[model samples]
Target: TELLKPRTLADLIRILHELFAGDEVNVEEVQAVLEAYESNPAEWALYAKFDQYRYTRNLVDQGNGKFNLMILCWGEGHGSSIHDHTDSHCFLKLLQGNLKETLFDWPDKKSNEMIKKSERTLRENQCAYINDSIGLHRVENVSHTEPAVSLHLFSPPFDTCHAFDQRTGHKNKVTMTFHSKFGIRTP
Candidate 1:
């Protein structure tokens, strides 16, 4: 089953290469990656794998102009908080299972946060591109009934991401660490 899915360091490197080489960016690359996992749907069903599959990204330029890549694997009730990329652009690709994604946009940085925008669905092997400069959003797994996994790419690589609480505009500065390259700060 691992053979059917990308399970080795080399597989990850190939994906990173495509993600970083900014010559092209489109739906095809994203779909091909997800399709690799869906090929062995039965095996992935037994249990959630790679709950902590953490890795540092090799210095890859986000294709066509996107930030860094952050791939997260979720098991049952795990999800991410409503956040923003400190005014940048990003793309989310659903590798397995379904998720509920909500998006928000503000006229100005001073405007009150509102449900002015949102999106929710059970996306299986699909991708959504977001202009984080204007769109703020959050994502969660709907199939805690099962398990899910997703891969994300942020342009210019993650450099001091600002996470915001939707309930309260409280914010925090999060430094990003990459796969392959360890113990280095983004300048």
Candidate 2:
């Protein structure tokens, strides 16, 4: 895990390229990078204290259908509701702590009123991918007492995401929200 070191966004991109350039872009390539990050957990552990949050920066606009990246660190109790990435590709790399990523796949609409489909947990330094094809899931900290953090990459970028509600069969439009100094400030 010595490979896991404090790095900038560009540093991560470089690693990503090297991993993906291999003949096959299989799960192994993705896990290698993720395991590297996991092995080098101190890169993130240095700032584990709650006094302050260390965030490098971000890039939201991905013109011409390029990829956008975000690096984030969390303290505790951070999580997101079950949702899907309407029409883009998503790749998540666990950097520091463990995150309980619950993945879901629905059954035929008529089978039941509202079904949760299936679920699984992605452990520390794990990698998961999702596109329009398969992604109706949610992620959260395994415990409220521990911090969970990861780097997210979205292809073609995204200004808005569609959130689904199986109960009402309502599909609502949502825009990503954040505030300075406070990560995921909104509900």
**Model 2: per-residue Cα lDDT over 47-101, one tens digit each:** 2233233223233223233555555555566666567675766777776677776
The alpha-carbon deviation from the true structure for residue 6 of candidate 2, after best TM-score superposition, in angstroms, is 12
Q: What C-alpha lDDT values do all the predictions have?
A: 0.54, 0.55
Error of 2 at 29 (Å): 4.2
Alpha-carbon error at 46 in model 2, in Å? 11
Report the number of the highest-TM-score candidate: 2
lDDT of 1 by residue, 29-77 (tens): 5434544544244432222233342322233333434445455566566
- Candidate 1 regions exceeding 4 Å error are 1-67, 107-113, 176-187
